[PDB]
Each structure stands twice: as structure tokens, then as C-alpha cells.
Amino acid sequence: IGFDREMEYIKDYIDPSGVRINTGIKYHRITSKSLDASQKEYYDIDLAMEAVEEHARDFLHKKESQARRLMDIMGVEPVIVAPFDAELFGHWWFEGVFFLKRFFELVNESKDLKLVTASEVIDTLEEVQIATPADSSWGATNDWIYRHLHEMIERMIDLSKKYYNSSDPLVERVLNQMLRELFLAQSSDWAFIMTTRTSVQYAENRTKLHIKRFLNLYDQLVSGRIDEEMLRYYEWTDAIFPEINFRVMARDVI
Amino acid sequence: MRGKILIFLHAHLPYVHHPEYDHFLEERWLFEAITETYIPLLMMFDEIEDFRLTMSITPPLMEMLSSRDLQEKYERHMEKLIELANKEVERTKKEHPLKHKMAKFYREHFEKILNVFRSYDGNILEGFKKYQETGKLEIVTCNATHAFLPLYQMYPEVVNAQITVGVKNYEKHMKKHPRGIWLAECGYYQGLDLYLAQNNVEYFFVDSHAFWFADEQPRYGVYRPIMTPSGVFAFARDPESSEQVWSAAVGYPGDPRYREFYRD
Numbered sequence: 001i002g003f004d005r006e007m008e009y010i011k012d013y014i015d016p017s018g019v020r021i022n023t024g025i026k027y028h029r030i031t032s033k034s035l036d037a038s039q040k041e042y043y044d045i046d047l048a049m050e051a052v053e054e055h056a057r058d059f060l061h062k063k064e065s066q067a068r069r070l071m072d073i074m075g076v077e078p079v080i081v082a083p084f085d086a087e088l089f090g091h092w093w094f095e096g097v098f099f100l101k102r103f104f105e106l107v108n109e110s111k112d113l114k115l116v117t118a119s120e121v122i123d124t125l126e127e128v129q130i131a132t133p134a135d136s137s138w139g140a141t142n143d144w145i146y147r148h149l150h151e152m153i154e155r156m157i158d159l160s161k162k163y164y165n166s167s168d169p170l171v172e173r174v175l176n177q178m179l180r181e182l183f184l185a186q187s188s189d190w191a192f193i194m195t196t197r198t199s200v201q202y203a204e205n206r207t208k209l210h211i212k213r214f215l216n217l218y219d220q221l222v223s224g225r226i227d228e229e230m231l232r233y234y235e236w237t238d239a240i241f242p243e244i245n246f247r248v249m250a251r252d253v254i
Numbered sequence: 255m256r257g258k259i260l261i262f263l264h265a266h267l268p269y270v271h272h273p274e275y276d277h278f279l280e281e282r283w284l285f286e287a288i289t290e291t292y293i294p295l296l297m298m299f300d301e302i303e304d305f306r307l308t309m310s311i312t313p314p315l316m317e318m319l320s321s322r323d324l325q326e327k328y329e330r331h332m333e334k335l336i337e338l339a340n341k342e343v344e345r346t347k348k349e350h351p352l353k354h355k356m357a358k359f360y361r362e363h364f365e366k367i368l369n370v371f372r373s374y375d376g377n378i379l380e381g382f383k384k385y386q387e388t389g390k391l392e393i394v395t396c397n398a399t400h401a402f403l404p405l406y407q408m409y410p411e412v413v414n415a416q417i418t419v420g421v422k423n424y425e426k427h428m429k430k431h432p433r434g435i436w437l438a439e440c441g442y443y444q445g446l447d448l449y450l451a452q453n454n455v456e457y458f459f460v461d462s463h464a465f466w467f468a469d470e471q472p473r474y475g476v477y478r479p480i481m482t483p484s485g486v487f488a489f490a491r492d493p494e495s496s497e498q499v500w501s502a503a504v505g506y507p508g509d510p511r512y513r514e515f516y517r518d
Contacts, residue, residue, distance in 0.1 A: 212275070215276075216275060216276040219276055220276065227273075227276070229273060230273060230274060230275075230276070233273075233274055
């Protein structure tokens with residue numbers, strides 16, 4: 001309705017800038033494969049529930065079928081690992097948690113299938129093979145950012161060792177915020193993100209912002225001119241791990 | 255009898271204060287203005303035997319020059335620059351002799367500048383204040399934020415507050431009420447002299463069109479001030495002494511013997 005409702009009606013639920021955005025109250029169903037979004041029909045939550053009921057039994061029958069085939073080929077119970085982005089359930093797909101609930105209840109009734117958590121399985125399994133996993137990920141210039149990351153990590157390590165035994169709580173606050181800044185600049189989100197309406201823009205702006213904040217602190221530290229008001233500004237805006245200790249960076253490796 | 259020459263310099267920069275960063279791009283404008291213009295004026299007032307000059311120092315610019323975090327940043331900028339000056343006097347030694355010679359001029363000059371800045375404990379307003387006390391310099395205020403007042407004429411509260419805030423801000427730094435004011439862009443609309451009178455302002459500056467287009471033109475044109483009915487004196491720009499005389503395209507600064515700005 002933030003795109004549909006009249007501007008005077010909708011003004012103080014969109015952006016203070018006056019730009020149209022999503023409100024969270026939405027009235028249409030997907031309707032069809034049409035590219036003409038104006039032809040979309042109104043949402044009926046009862047039909048939507050009928051869809052989840054069908055889909056949840058589709059998925060159930062697929063997992064039972066897969067289980068039985070695997071038991072017969074394996075001779076032990078398969079553990080079927082199925083990870084999803086959380087926001088896929090309820091956010092991208094409004095009915096997702098409803099689906100999750102129906103699928104759980106169905107699996108609960110199933111004679112072919114059990115829901116397990118991952119810690120239940122490590123606590124229960126007696127035969128498990130030993131193996132070493134290959135380099136991998138679940139995977140999908142611009143190198144001013146990289147040489148800066150390189151120098152920040154290298155510098156962060158130096159200073160954490162250099163001030164390992166310091167008891168100066170100002171230097172410590174500074175080093176602690178440097179690490180936060182460094183970590184904040186490392187967010188994968190800012191790099192090859194899972195940003196919805198993100199666009200490589202707020203993102204590389206994020207990265208550089210944290211790089212710059214880190215270099216500011218580095219400069220004040222290295223030269224005696226710690227600027228306490230700026231540091232407090234940084235502590236406030238970039239407040240992530242209050243309990244952090246820069247000394248994590250001075251530990252051995254290998 | 256002798257003709258009277260009134261040279262007026264408008265010294266303004268927007269308030270740009272970014273204490274969240276350690277070097278910010280638009281804080282360098284201030285540093286170049288201090289280095290290139292404000293301190294060399296000070297040096298010139300000191301060196302010359304006698305002068306008479308009127309200038310504005312706008313409240314945004316007074317507020318920046320007095321800010322003792324900017325003074326610290328400027329001092330550190332000036333040292334970075336004298337360090338570069340030195341790197342340059344050696345690197346130039348086997349290059350062109352003009353170029354070598356300039357690098358040494360630059361070293362001595364920058365040292366001199368930072369030294370004047372230190373003479374004043376880094377508040378150069380103290381230097382300008384001291385020349386006002388002699389009567390050789392006259393410093394007028396400006397509206398608080400260099401807003402263009404004719405844009406806001408329908409909002410007399412913001413207009414008059416623009417004026418008063420400037421006036422008080424000047425008092426704070428200068429320890430004296432301002433007598434004259436420079437309006438941003440000489441933006442003047444009819445009635446504004448009243449607020450100036452309410453603010454105890456004695457004189458302002460207008461564009462030539464303020465006299466030419468008056469209901470009856472002033473008898474001596476732009477070559478004598480007028481007094482508004484309210485008792486406020488207005489000084490109109492000599493259009494024969496316009497911007498063009500200082501144009502690089504058509505005026506003195508465009509002379510081939512002068513230092514090129516866009517090579518660095």
C-alpha cells in the first residue's frame with residue numbers, strides 16, 4: 001500500500017524523504033506468471049493455506065521417498081541436511097513459517113521420518129567415518145579495499161602484540177575499536193552480499209567507512225594524539241562487541 | 255581634494271566541521287584559505303607602513319578559526335607541508351633552477367606562515383582584532399549563516415535572527431559591537447534596513463542596481479553613500495571596479511608571468 005495508497009494518506013508511513021517504500025501490509029497474491037503486475041488479484045489467505053497443505057505433503061512425500069531409498073541402499077539411517085536462509089520463511093515467502101509448521105507436524109506423524117537437531121545426531125551416532133573435507137563453499141579491480149584490508153590486519157597484529165601487556169585503558173579502548181572496525185569491514189555482506197535491495201553502493205560505502213575509521217584510530221595511536229571525542233563517537237555508532245579484547249589478535253597460530 | 259578609495263574584502267567560508275574524521279577533504283579549503291590568504295594579509299598589514307581596508311569575517315569563518323581543534327589540525331597540516339617542502343628542496347636540486355629556487359621559497363614561506371600562526375597561539379582572529387584597534391582595518395559582520403536574506407523575506411523572524419546571531423557572534427569574538435554588515439550576495443530587499451537599525455547596524459553594502467533602480471536615483475550615483483530614512487548608511491559597488499578586473503580570462507591575474515593554479 002506504500003506504492004498504491006494515495007500520497008496524502010500514506011505520507012508518514014513511508015520514508016521521511018517522501019519516497020515510496022514497503023509498509024508490510026500487502027493485499028495481492030502472485031496470481032500468475034504475468035509480467036503485468038497490475039493484473040494481480042487480491043490475496044485470499046484460505047486458498048494460501050490450501051497451497052501450504054499441498055506443498056507440505058509434497059515435500060513430506062519427497063523426503064519419505066528419499067529416506068526409504070537411502071535406508072535400503074545404505075543400511076543405516078540417512079541424515080538429510082537441509083539448510084535455508086531464515087528470511088526465506090515468512091519474509092520472502094509470507095506463508096513460509098506456516099509451511100514449516102505443517103511440515104514438522106507431518107514429519108512428526110510420519111512412520112518413515114524423524115526430525116532431529118544436529119547436536120542430537122552427534123550425541124547419538126556410533127558409526128561415523130573419518131574424513132577431511134575439501135576446500136569449499138555454498139557459493140555465489142575493487143582492490144583498494146584489499147590492500148587496505150591486508151595492511152589493517154598486519155597492523156592490528158603488530159599493535160596487539162606491542163601492547164599485549166599495556167594497562168593503559170585508553171590505548172585499550174582504541175585497540176578494541178580498531179578490531180571492531182576491522183571486523184565490520186570484513187562482513188561478507190559488504191562484498192558479495194545477500195543484500196535484498198542493497199546494491200553494491202551502501203555496501204562498498206560501508207566497507208570504506210570502517211576502513212577509514214580504523215585508519216583514523218591507527219593514526220592517533222601511532223602519534224600520541226588519541227582523540228577521545230572521536231573515539232567515543234566510534235564506540236557509540238560501532239558498538240558491536242562491548243566485551244571484545246584486542247588481545248585475541250596477539251595469539252599464536254598454525 | 256582627493257578621491258576616496260574604499261577596498262572591501264569579503265572573507266567567508268561555509269561552516270564545515272567534521273570532527274568524526276582525522277583528515278576530511280573539505281576541511282582543506284579552510285587550510286588553504288588560512289595559508290594563501292588570511293595569514294599573508296596579516297603579514298602584509300605588519301610589513302606595510304600604513305593602509306586602510308574594510309573586510310568581512312563572517313560568523314561561520316570566525317567560528318572555525320577560533321575552534322581550537324581546527325587550529326591543532328592546521329598546525330599538523332602545516333608541518334606535513336613543511337616536511338614536503340624539504341623533500342622538495344632536495345628532489346629539485348638537479349632539476350630546473352627556477353623549480354629548485356621555488357622549492358626553497360616554499361620552505362621559507364611555509365615556515366614563516368606557521369610561525370605567524372604560532373605568534374597568535376593559533377587564533378589569527380587576535381591578529382585581525384589588533385589591526386581593527388589601530389583603525390587601519392575595519393571588520394564588518396555578516397548574517398549568521400550567510401543565508402541569502404531575500405529568499406527568506408516572508409519569514410522576518412529568521413531574517414532578523416540571522417542578523418542578530420551574526421551581530422552577537424561578532425561581539426563575542428571581537429569584544430566590540432560591529433558597526434557595519436555585509437549581507438550575503440548583497441541580497442537586500444526593501445525594509446531590511448529597519449532590522450539592521452533595530453540591530454544597531456550603522457552601514458551595509460549593496461549592488462549598484464540598488465541605487466540605479468531606486469525611485470529617484472541618488473544624485474552622486476554610486477560614488478557617495480546614501481543614508482536610509484532609518485539612518486542606516488548604504489555603500490554601493492563601483493561597477494567600474496567589478497569582478498572582471500580580477501578575471502583570469504580578461505584581467506590582471508591572467509598575465510602569463512603569474513603562477514598557474516592548476517599545476518601542482
